Symmetry: D2
Subunit: 311 residues, 4 copies
Amino acid sequence: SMIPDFMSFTSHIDELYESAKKQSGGKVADYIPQLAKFSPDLWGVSVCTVDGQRHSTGDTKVPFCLQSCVKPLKYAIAVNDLGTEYVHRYVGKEPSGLNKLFLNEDDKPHNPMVNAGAIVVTSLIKQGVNNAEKFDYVMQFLNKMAGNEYVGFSNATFQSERESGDRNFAIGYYLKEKKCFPEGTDMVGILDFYFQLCSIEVTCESASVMAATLANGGFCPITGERVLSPEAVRNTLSLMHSCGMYDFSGQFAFHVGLPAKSGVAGGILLVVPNVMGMMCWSPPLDKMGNSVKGIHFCHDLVSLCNFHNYD
Amino acid sequence: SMIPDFMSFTSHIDELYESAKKQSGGKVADYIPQLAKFSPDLWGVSVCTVDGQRHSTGDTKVPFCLQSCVKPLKYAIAVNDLGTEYVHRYVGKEPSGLNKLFLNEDDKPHNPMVNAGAIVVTSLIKQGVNNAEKFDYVMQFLNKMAGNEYVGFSNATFQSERESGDRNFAIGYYLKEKKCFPEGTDMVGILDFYFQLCSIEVTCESASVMAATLANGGFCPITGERVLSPEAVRNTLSLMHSCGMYDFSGQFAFHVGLPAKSGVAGGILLVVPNVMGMMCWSPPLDKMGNSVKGIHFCHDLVSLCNFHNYD
Amino acid sequence: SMIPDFMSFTSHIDELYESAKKQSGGKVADYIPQLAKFSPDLWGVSVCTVDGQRHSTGDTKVPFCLQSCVKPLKYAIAVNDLGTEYVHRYVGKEPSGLNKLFLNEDDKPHNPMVNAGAIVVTSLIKQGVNNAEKFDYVMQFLNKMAGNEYVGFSNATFQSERESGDRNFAIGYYLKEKKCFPEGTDMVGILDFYFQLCSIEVTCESASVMAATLANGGFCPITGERVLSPEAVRNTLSLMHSCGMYDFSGQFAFHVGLPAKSGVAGGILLVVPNVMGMMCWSPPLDKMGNSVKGIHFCHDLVSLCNFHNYD
Amino acid sequence: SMIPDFMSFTSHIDELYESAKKQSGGKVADYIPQLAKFSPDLWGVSVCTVDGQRHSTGDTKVPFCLQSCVKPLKYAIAVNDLGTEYVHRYVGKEPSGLNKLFLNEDDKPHNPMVNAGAIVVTSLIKQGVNNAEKFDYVMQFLNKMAGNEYVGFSNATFQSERESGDRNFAIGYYLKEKKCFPEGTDMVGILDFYFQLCSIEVTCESASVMAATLANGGFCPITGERVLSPEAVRNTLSLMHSCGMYDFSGQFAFHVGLPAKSGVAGGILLVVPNVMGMMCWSPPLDKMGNSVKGIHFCHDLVSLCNFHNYD
C-alpha cells in the first residue's frame, strides 16, 4: 500500500481532475455521428483500488464506447482460454516502427493493440459457436471484470462502424490472403464480431473496476472472484505498457510508466499494478488520438504520486 | 526500316525461337487450376510489323489469358477517352521502390502497371454504363487493336480469379478508404470488371497485332485504322518501358530497352517502336513472375538485331 | 523484500547457473581479435542486493569489456548532470522499427541504447574539458557506481575498435551532417571518447554492484552513497526495459520484463528494481547479439522467482 | 534527320529560350559560397548536332561546375575501360524508391546517378595510378568528348566541397564498411578524387559537345573521333533516362522522354539520340534540385519538336 490514507489520496485525485479540466484542446472524433455527438466538456475520472475502495469525479456515469479500450480485454480473454503459446502463433508481442504496414516480419500482426492484431485475436475467441453466442460469452466475461457494473451496447455505433470500416475490411482481406486466421474462419463474420466488441458501452465507474481487476492479478476487487489467469493479466499489462497509447506509446512508457490503453471515444484505461484501476474519459482527442485531458491527468498523477514503474 | 529483308529477319526469329526453346526452367503459375492446366512446353512467338507483315513459330494459336498483359491496354483506352491529365489525377507515372505498399506519397497507386493502379484505371473507363456494357466497350476496343483477330474470354479463369483474389479485395477496400476512386464508384463492381478484363483470351498471333498497333502510333497495321490517340500510345509505351516487367523492370529497361509487359499466363507483350509488335508466350515463369523462355528470347533479340532503345 | 532468505535464494541462483551452463550454442564475437580470444566456456553470474549482500558463481572475476553495456551508464551520467530535458533535445525516448536508418522523424537518434544514440550522448558529457579529462570523469563515476570494485581499461580493445569502426564513423559524419551534436563538438574526438568508453573493463562482480546501484534508486548498495539522481535512474531503467537487448528487446520485455542491457562481450547487465543488481557473462552470442547462456538464465530466473515487472 | 532545316530549327530554339527566360522561380544553391555567387539571371542554351552544327543563345560562355552532371560521364568512362559486367559488380542498374538509404538489396549503390553510386564508380577508374594521374586521365577524356573545347577546374569549389561534404564522408565510410570498394581502395583518397571531378568547369558550349558525343554513339561530332564504346554510351543513356533528374526522374521520363542529367550548378545535360547534344544552364533550382528554366525549356522542346522517346 502506497496510499496509506485513501481518503486523502482522493482529495488529490480531485485536485488533478480540476487541473486537467482546464485543458480544452483537442478535437472530438467525428468519423461517425455517434462520436461527433459528444460534448467536448464531458470529463470523468474513476478510481477503484485493489481493496475495493471507489471514488469518482466528473461525468463518471455517462455511457461511452470502449472502442480500442476493448483490445486489451479481448486479448486477456484469449490468453486466459488458450494460453500464451497458442494466441501468439497468430499475433506478435511488440511495437511496430510507425507507411504503417499490416503484418510484421513473419506475416503476423505486430501486436494485439493495433487493429490487425485485435482482429486476429477476435478470431481466436470461442471458435465454433456462432457470433451471437460469442458475443454473450465476451459480455459475460466483461461483467465479471466489472463486478457486474454497467456494461452496455451501442447498436448505433456498431452499425456506423460496420458500414464505414473500409480500412478494417482492407485489413480483413489482407489477413485472409496471408493466411493469418485459424483454419475455417469466416473473415467477414469476424469483422462483424469485431465491430460489435468496439461498440460495447461502459462508464468511468464500471471501467475502473475492469482496470482494477487487471491491477489485482485477475481478481475482481469488488467480488473477490478470479476472472483472468495470472498469465493472461501479465501479458495484457506488458502489451499495454508498450503499445497501449497508439503513437504515443513510447512517450507514455517513458514519462508515465504505467499500463494504459486509449480509445477514440476519449477514454483511457489506466492501471497501477497492485494499487488501483482507473478510467479517464474526455471526448477531445489530440493528433495522436488520445484524450487531451486524459493524457494531462496521467502525467500529473505520476509526478504527484510517484506511481511510475521505476520509482 | 531496320528490317530490309523481312523474309531473312524471319529466319533469325526462328533461330532465336529455337534457342530459347532449350530453356526449360521456371514454374507454371498454379494459384488457380486454370493456369496450372498449361503445359510447360508450350512456346510461341508471333511478329507483326508496322507494315502488316506477319510471322509465327511455335504454339501461336493456343488461346491464353492476357492477365497483367491487359494493364497497358486498358490504360491506353483510358488516356484515349479521357486524356493524360484526368487519368493521372488517380494514378501515378513511375516505378515504386519494391514491404510493397499500395499507395504513393499522394495516396495514388504508383502507376497503371501495378494491381492497385490497374484497378483504379478500370474505374475510370466508360463510367455510367453497367458492367456488361463496359465489358463490350473494351472488347470492341481490343478487337480494333487486333485487327479483328482472336479475342476471347475465359469464364473459368474469371470465376477462379474472383473467388480467390483476396489481395485484390484488400486493395479494393484500401483504395476506397483512401478515396482513390471517382465519385460514386461501385468498388466491388469494379473489382468484378477487373477480374473479367484479366480473363480476356488471345493468341500470340492476335496479341502481336495489338502490340504492333502500339508500335504503329495507334494505327492497326492490318486495317490502317486509328485505334488509339498518339497521346495514349506514347504514355502506354513510357510506362511499359519502366514498369512492365514487375520486379525485373529495371534490368529489362537496362538490358533490353524495349516497352514490354508480362503476365502470369506466361505471355510477354513486346513493342519495337516504329518497327513491329510481338507476343512471346511460355507458361513457365521465373521468381520475378516473367516467362523464362520469353525473357531469354527478348535478350537474344536485342543483342542480335540491336533494337535497344539506345543503339 | 521478495527474497526472505537470501541464503536459500543463493542456492537457486546456483541451480539456474548450472542449468544455463548446459547451453553451448552461440558464436563468440570475432570482428576483432580482442573478442575472438575469449573461451566460449567462460560463464559467470554475480548478484548484489539492495542490502549489499553478494554472491557469485562461475568465472566472476575474469575482466571483460562493457561494450554496449556502458550505454545505459553514460546515459545515466548525462541525465544526472544535465537533466532529462537537455539530454533529450539530442536523443529520442523509444525503440525504432528495426534497413535500420540512423535518425528518427526529428533527425535525432531513436534512443540512447543504439550506437547513434550512445555517440550523441557521449558528446553531451563533460563538455569543455579535453578527452583525457572527460575519460577520468566517467571513470570516477563508474567507480562510485561499483563501490570502488574492479573497473579497468583495455587499450588493445580500444585500438582495435577505433581502427575498425568504419560504421561508427559513417554514423559520426552523418550525425555531424544533420547537426545532431552540440555547438562546437569535435566529432572525431567524440568517436574516440566513444571507443574508449566501450573498452572499459569490469568483472561480473564489480558490474553487479553497478546494476545494484540502479536497482537502488541511485544509491551504491555497498557504500550507501548517492551516485545518480532519481530522475537519471528511472530514465535509464525505462530505456533498458525497451531498448536494452538489441532486436530482442520486445521479446525480452514481454517474457522477462526486467531492465537489462547486453554487450558484444557476452555480458548482460540485469536489474530487479528495489531488489538486486546482476551481471551475467558468457562470450557466445546468438543471432540477436545477446549471450546465449545469459538469455537462458534470465528466462529461468523470472519463471522461478516471479520477478517479472507484472506479477 | 528530324531537323531538315537546322537554320529554322535554330529560330525555334531561340523562341523556346526566350519563353523559359520568363520563368524566374527557384533558388540558387547556396550550401557553399562558390554556388551562391551566381546570378539567378544567368541563362544559356547550347546545341550541337550529330553533324557538328552549333548554336547558342544566352550566357553560353560563362564557366560553371558540372557537379552531378559529371556522373554520367565518369560512368561512361568506367564502362568504356572496364565493360558493363565489371562496373556493375559494384553499382546497380535502376532507380531506388526515394528515408533514402545508401545501399540496395545487395549492398550496392542503386545506380551511378546517385552519390553513393558515383563514389563507387570513381573508385573503379584508373586504379593503381595516383590521384593526380587519375585526374589528368579523366580530364584528357573530357576534352575528347568536348572536341577540345572549354574544360576547366574550380579549386575554390573543390576546397569548399571537400571541407563541407560531411554526408559524402558518411557515405564513404558506410560503403567501406559494407566492402563496396575494390580491394585496396584508399576511401578518403577516392572522396578527394570525387570532389575534384564535381569541380570540373565547362560552358554550355563545351558541354553541348559532350552531350552530342553521347548523342552520336560515342563519336565526337566535331572531331569525328571515337571517344566512348557503343556499349558505354548505351548504358549511360539508359541510366540518364531513368535516374538523371533526381526525384524528378519519373516525371521527366514520362513527360520529356529524353536522357538528361541535372546538377546543383543549374545545368542540365540533355541528349536527343542520333540528333543532338544540349546543355541548358540557369542557377535557380526548384525543390527537386533541377534548374527551373532548364526544366521548363525541356518540356517546351519536346512538345514543339516531338523529340520524346516514343513519338
